[PDB]
Design a protein around this ligand. Sequence first.
Ligand SMILES: *[C@@H]1O[C@H](CO)[C@@H](O[C@@H]2O[C@H](CO)[C@@H](O)[C@H](O)[C@H]2NC(C)=O)[C@H](O)[C@H]1NC(C)=O
Ligand SMILES: C[C@@H](NCCc1nsc2ccccc12)c1cccc2c1OCO2
Ligand SMILES: C[C@@H](NCCc1nsc2ccccc12)c1cccc2c1OCO2
Ligand SMILES: N[C@@H](Cc1c[nH]c2ccccc12)C(=O)O
Ligand SMILES: N[C@@H](Cc1c[nH]c2ccccc12)C(=O)O
Ligand SMILES: *[C@@H]1O[C@H](CO)[C@@H](O)[C@H](O)[C@H]1NC(C)=O
Ligand SMILES: *[C@@H]1O[C@H](CO)[C@@H](O)[C@H](O)[C@H]1NC(C)=O
Ligand SMILES: *[C@@H]1O[C@H](CO)[C@@H](O)[C@H](O)[C@H]1NC(C)=O
Ligand SMILES: *[C@@H]1O[C@H](CO)[C@@H](O)[C@H](O)[C@H]1NC(C)=O
Ligand SMILES: *[C@@H]1O[C@H](CO)[C@@H](O)[C@H](O)[C@H]1NC(C)=O
Ligand SMILES: [Ca+2]
Ligand SMILES: [Ca+2]
Ligand SMILES: [Ca+2]
Ligand SMILES: [Ca+2]
Ligand SMILES: [Ca+2]
Ligand SMILES: [Ca+2]
Ligand SMILES: [Ca+2]
Ligand SMILES: [Ca+2]
Lengths: 772, 768
Amino acid sequence: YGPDQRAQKKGDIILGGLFPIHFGVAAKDQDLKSRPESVECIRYNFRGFRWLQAMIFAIEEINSSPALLPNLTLGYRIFDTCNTVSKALEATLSFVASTIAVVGATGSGVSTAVANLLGLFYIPQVSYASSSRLLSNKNQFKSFLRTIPNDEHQATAMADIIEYFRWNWVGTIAADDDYGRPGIEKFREEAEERDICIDFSELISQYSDEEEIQHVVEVIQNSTAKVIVVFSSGPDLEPLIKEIVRRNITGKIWLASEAWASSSLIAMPQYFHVVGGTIGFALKAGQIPGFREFLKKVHPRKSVHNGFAKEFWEETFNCHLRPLCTGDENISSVETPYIDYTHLRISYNVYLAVYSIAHALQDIYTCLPGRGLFTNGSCADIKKVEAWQVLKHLRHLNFTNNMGEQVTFDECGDLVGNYSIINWHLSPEDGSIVFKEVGYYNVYAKKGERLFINEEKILWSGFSREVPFSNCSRDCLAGTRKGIIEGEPTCCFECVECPDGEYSDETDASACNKCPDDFWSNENHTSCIAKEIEFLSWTEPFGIALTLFAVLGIFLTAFVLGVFIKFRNTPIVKATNRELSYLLLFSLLCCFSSSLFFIGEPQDWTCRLRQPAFGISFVLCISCILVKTNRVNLQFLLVFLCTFMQIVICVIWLYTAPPSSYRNQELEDEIIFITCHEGSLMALGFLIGYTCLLAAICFFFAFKSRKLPENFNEAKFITFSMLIFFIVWISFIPAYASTYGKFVSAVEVIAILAASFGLLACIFFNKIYIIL
Amino acid sequence: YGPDQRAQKKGDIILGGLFPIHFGVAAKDQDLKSRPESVECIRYNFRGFRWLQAMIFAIEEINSSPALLPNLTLGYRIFDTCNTVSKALEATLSFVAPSTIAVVGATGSGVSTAVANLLGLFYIPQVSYASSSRLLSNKNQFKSFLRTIPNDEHQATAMADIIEYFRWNWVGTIAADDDYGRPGIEKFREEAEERDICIDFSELISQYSDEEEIQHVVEVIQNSTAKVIVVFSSGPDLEPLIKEIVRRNITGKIWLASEAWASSSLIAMPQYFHVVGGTIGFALKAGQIPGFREFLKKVHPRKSVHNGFAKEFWEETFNCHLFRPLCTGDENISSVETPYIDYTHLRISYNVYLAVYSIAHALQDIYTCLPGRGLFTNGSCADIKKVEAWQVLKHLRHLNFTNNMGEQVTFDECGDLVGNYSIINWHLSPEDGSIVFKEVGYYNVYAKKGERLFINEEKILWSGFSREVPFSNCSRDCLAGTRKGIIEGEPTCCFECVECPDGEYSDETDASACNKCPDDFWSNENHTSCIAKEIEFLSWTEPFGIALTLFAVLGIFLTAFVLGVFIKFRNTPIVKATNRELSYLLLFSLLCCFSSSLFFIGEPQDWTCRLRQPAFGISFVLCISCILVKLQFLLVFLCTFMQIVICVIWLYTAPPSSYRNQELEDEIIFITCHEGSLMALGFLIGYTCLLAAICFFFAFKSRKLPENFNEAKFITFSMLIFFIVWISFIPAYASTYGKFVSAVEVIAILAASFGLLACIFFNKIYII
Ligand SMILES: *[C@@H]1O[C@H](CO)[C@@H](O[C@@H]2O[C@H](CO)[C@@H](O)[C@H](O)[C@H]2NC(C)=O)[C@H](O)[C@H]1NC(C)=O
Ligand SMILES: C[C@@H](NCCc1nsc2ccccc12)c1cccc2c1OCO2
Ligand SMILES: C[C@@H](NCCc1nsc2ccccc12)c1cccc2c1OCO2
Ligand SMILES: N[C@@H](Cc1c[nH]c2ccccc12)C(=O)O
Ligand SMILES: N[C@@H](Cc1c[nH]c2ccccc12)C(=O)O
Ligand SMILES: *[C@@H]1O[C@H](CO)[C@@H](O)[C@H](O)[C@H]1NC(C)=O
Ligand SMILES: *[C@@H]1O[C@H](CO)[C@@H](O)[C@H](O)[C@H]1NC(C)=O
Ligand SMILES: *[C@@H]1O[C@H](CO)[C@@H](O)[C@H](O)[C@H]1NC(C)=O
Ligand SMILES: *[C@@H]1O[C@H](CO)[C@@H](O)[C@H](O)[C@H]1NC(C)=O
Ligand SMILES: *[C@@H]1O[C@H](CO)[C@@H](O)[C@H](O)[C@H]1NC(C)=O
Ligand SMILES: [Ca+2]
Ligand SMILES: [Ca+2]
Ligand SMILES: [Ca+2]
Ligand SMILES: [Ca+2]
Ligand SMILES: [Ca+2]
Ligand SMILES: [Ca+2]
Ligand SMILES: [Ca+2]
Ligand SMILES: [Ca+2]
């Protein structure tokens, strides 16, 4: 028979309906000491009553209009589910015990149970609010069609919003039923496809225990993420919100699904300091003329067909039929969600479901023999119509709304729809919560072009304007790279500085970069500068300071030669071998010239001659000075033999292993020296040793004859010059052995100039002075 | 009402049952051109028929029992579900319409949910034997559901435990899109995230999935690189994907099976063994029912009047009709190989047995009571004549009894039992080629968190014919010389091995960042451990140190010998020619100046480098003061006084000390002692040079003279060698750094001192 409380009217064709007039059942749990009784409902639902009114209005208008079903009256039989499976199953047993269509339930689990029962007898069921993707399976739910889309697009939209605002550190919360779980799974898949890290994920219910509530609250508090995505309804979300308000946890960003984005259970001013600035999804609104007047024309006395109106009035005016009420009140004098609304969405879905059933019936009525949807093109009988025939016509139906929009059901009985994005604000007039549109979501568009948000219209946490931060890690700038933190996701990391020789340019770099082998890292490891070249050369202090002196010395020896040629007749110049003084002076010229190879860029030919040139010149000079004394042509044989021995040594050295240039970068890694090694060391030792031996022989021979004052005391000055040569060579040995930079080149030229100047002066100063 | 074929008997109390005698319905595109008819299920289920026989046997045993419910008969009313929700609601609508007191539940979790929604309306107890979904464990929605099987939270935790125990971190998952696979896979995902395990892919399958979906799932499996796949499904829902994978020949995966298909005969076939061999799965505890095999063998299409499925069972077993040939109801049931009588362990059959006996024990507890000792309001009882379903449910909630083995059976506040698990492995029969499941472990539940799993490796064949544990990590481990690096867009599971730079090292094998050892250390070439920094200074053991020491000691003894010969020959007129006392003091000062070069040897200490310079300054100023004059001790003291002043005030102000150089090289440290303030060192240098220059001038003023054996030019030469040797020092001092700065220092000191001694005392020594 069904529950006593009902709405019912008599007609030729009867329609069923299920609406949640209450929010749930009483908390008392029976221990089965006595006979179980009927469980009672506790809280009222003005929105659900409005939905029921919408269905009744649609049926009454259909019966009024003589263009949809002439000569045919439609009846209804509507019950209350109280948001629970047990009460909705009792009514469905009365439906199948006749109705040809049922306007479905609100919750997904309730709709699943009702559809399981109703598909046994092929009674079509049109739901207005159940959006679970599990109801699209046509192998299980053979009679289920709906006027609302499923939540795959809504989860994709949540991921799109998260990617738009550039967050990667979020938490999720879902209700423990067929609405929350599939939605949170689809969101998890999309988020992991978009590289988003989820911190925690918990479940809740309207009948959750205190320990579970505390545990969820403590997880939320212990987490460091700020954005929380919630897939639930108001009845299942209220206890957690109450506990969170009690614990005073603020500063979080909420992303709501459509089921509670506009719920009056949560949108309370006492909670606004926690759930302010909420961003959610809301479906498209429709328009139904005359509906508000129909709603305000309710009365427990003239609504004989309706039964819930008595309890409606009692819970509206707080009376009984706690003072007694005369029934003369006004619904406009009390503030309830009943007539206080701005947009109708699920009421419009109710309207659409009723009109879908009516249009299928009219399609059955109109068809002509031979042009049918049944076997042999036959046409159904309107006076004996059946539920399966109505279901077939519903699966082959499309029509046009009152706004000119076209309604078509797909192969899964699903429709396609648009979403809108709203933000929660505080009304400055009375402190109530107002829902302000800030965007939308387009489903007919392509991937990546479905979402539009006006950020300037969004208030964050209710009273701010700066986009929040939820990332688990502050990005580190150039010159540093990311480092793994163990046991944590990829979104959380530490940054460390890049070492020498490597650098990073772009932010959020996972590895430093090495510059090619002519560069070095900067001071901050952001750009690799050029490797500085360093070597003694011209246009530099030491180079000019040394060649200017080389030019001065070459001019001095040229002048000396000029004085000698001019005075080629004075007897003082005579008895000093004219054939050997010129050779000595020209060798001095050559030594001064060879002192110029040591300064410059070390090409492969400068370093093949810079040493042998000076060796040859000095051996020639010492050979000249070792025979110039008459206490010994045949004298030219000595200079020729000495110079030829030296030349032989240098040529065999150059044949076995010529020296070459060398770019040096091993001593230091920031500056690269271009200094040329000598190639071989035994031959260099030969070259040095021959000259040192000749110098020693000359020193000994001159030390033999110091006392003689003939020839202006030649031997003493010879000893002086050989001495200065020897000490100036000995002094710089550690510098020669500690080759570091460009100082080694300078000391070579210093020694060359010192020795040559000493020899020239000690030989010719007195001779020129007495001459002039 | 209800289906035509059924099992039914008469009694005072009637029991309901639901068993899957078919694997599913003949699905087809039913266009609604004509009135829809009843659908027909196709594939016969011998295991389901065995479960039905277990229920019937239990009821017959209870009726034969005199102790349990005497003078009372139990009846039954059993239907077939064909594994579908539609065919189970048709049967349930007759249960709630002789009244039914209890129903032995269904197999599938979704079917059980749909049935329980309707049975809890009338408070009819429902005891399921195979539904293990955790959604059925909340008592707000399901008021009269109990089960003789545990729920899947323990199984998911055990799967995570096994994965962690075998050291894998790269897996994929596959589930069935029903109330069984999804919550189980979700619990597994949470456990694996807790245990730091990585999931590559996660797909859904169904018995009625399409070709495109099956090929897409196969392509996901082939594209992925993981080897271990965790599956939460049943045989009917898993068959199509397995057949497609077998056709495409994808070999080399590791399968971890839940108890629904771990022993399923649909998947365990020799043809598929090359894809699903070496499967590791779960199984419940096995029971013992002593008189069950004979009862099963006693089936007959004519003697079993009360059984309606016996005729179809016979037809499917013997391929005949009651063109399929005619048959005789006298064949042998032992000559055909079907899962009917062929089995080693009864698990779901034992659960069916336990459900029936638990309902019986609740009824007996109702029957025997003492007034004032009842479970109802005023201690009163019910009556077995007019017992009711809610009273039976109350007693079932307050039931606690022991089975035939001797184990206590009781239900908690959620209606669930607790039970053990066994771990099995799929092998190949060496005699028949079939698939034989061999026990390899178990999973305790009464143990504390972390000691529940026991596994014995050596009994496992990994791919079917392999004896080595497979590798299923995203990337290979790093070494001690290298650390891991982040790959952008990929999880923390796989990485790249990046070598540490100079000055840093790593020790472990999975280091995420390599540190650095403190000062006086440096990383080696292999970057595994770091050697200590090498110290460097002019050491005595070094040959240069020994050479300088011998030179200084030789100079010391030479001056001592000169002093001794002067003292002994103090009567020679040549000693009186010059001053004897000044010669003595000058000799002692030359001794001091020679010995003052031993401070430049060894590791600089706090005082040594605070005295190396003042000693030489004082000694050389005395020596040159002696030469200049040569009373006179007054002038030598006056000349030394200002040097003493400068050195002592410098030591008071900024005493030098040893300093360590760590910023010049990498593996070599230097101890080059500070010079303090450069002003005092420069003042020392300048004053001693000025005195030497004054000596040079006053010696060159009278360089030509024969007195004192013509020594003025000798003094001039000594000062010349002093100046030149201390001038030809900067080009070797500025351009050299290291252990050579304190190497030519001693050279210059010794050269100057030896010259000063030889240019003076040699002539006077020669004549003597
Ligand atoms: C928070 O993290 C997100 C995600 O990594 C960052 O957004 C990225 O920013 C970089 C650098 O500009 C862009 O190249 C990426 O395209 C962004 N990702 C996305 C998905 O758009 C964001 O910059 C981070 N914010 C802070 C403050 O660190
Ligand atoms: C000026 C001198 N150059 C020798 C450079 C040198 N000497 S030792 C050492 C150690 C390490 C590195 C370099 C060096 C020279 C050249 C040619 C003939 C010579 C001669 O001097 C004697 O005859
Ligand atoms: C032995 C020396 N003390 C250290 C001198 C010194 N240290 S670094 C340096 C660099 C360039 C030149 C000199 C130095 C010394 C002491 C007193 C008088 C001296 C004298 O030498 C000249 O007269
Ligand atoms: N879509 C929700 C039902 C729902 C939609 N809008 C609502 C508003 C209030 C309450 C419930 C709802 C579900 O599947 O369960
Ligand atoms: N546990 C499975 C049912 C099940 C258990 N063992 C089985 C063996 C075969 C078939 C089904 C089953 C479920 O809840 O759905
Ligand atoms: C929708 O209705 C139109 C009439 O405007 C009809 O032509 C069409 O076949 C119907 N179906 C679809 C899928 O467009
Ligand atoms: C959905 O929204 C988009 C963007 O505003 C619009 O173009 C489209 O027409 C809308 N569709 C419907 C059916 O309203
Ligand atoms: C069930 O009975 C046994 C046997 O006496 C007893 O040990 C056990 O505690 C009982 N169960 C409960 C839940 O009390
Ligand atoms: C489960 O296994 C453990 C360890 O093997 C054992 O102690 C325990 O008795 C088992 N449980 C049952 C019910 O047999
Ligand atoms: C795989 O990874 C785990 C977890 O990081 C590690 O312990 C194990 O040693 C790895 N296995 C191999 C074979 O490298
Ligand atoms: Ca009409
Ligand atoms: Ca409802
Ligand atoms: Ca609401
Ligand atoms: Ca972790
Ligand atoms: Ca009995
Ligand atoms: Ca079943
Ligand atoms: Ca099976
Ligand atoms: Ca990615």
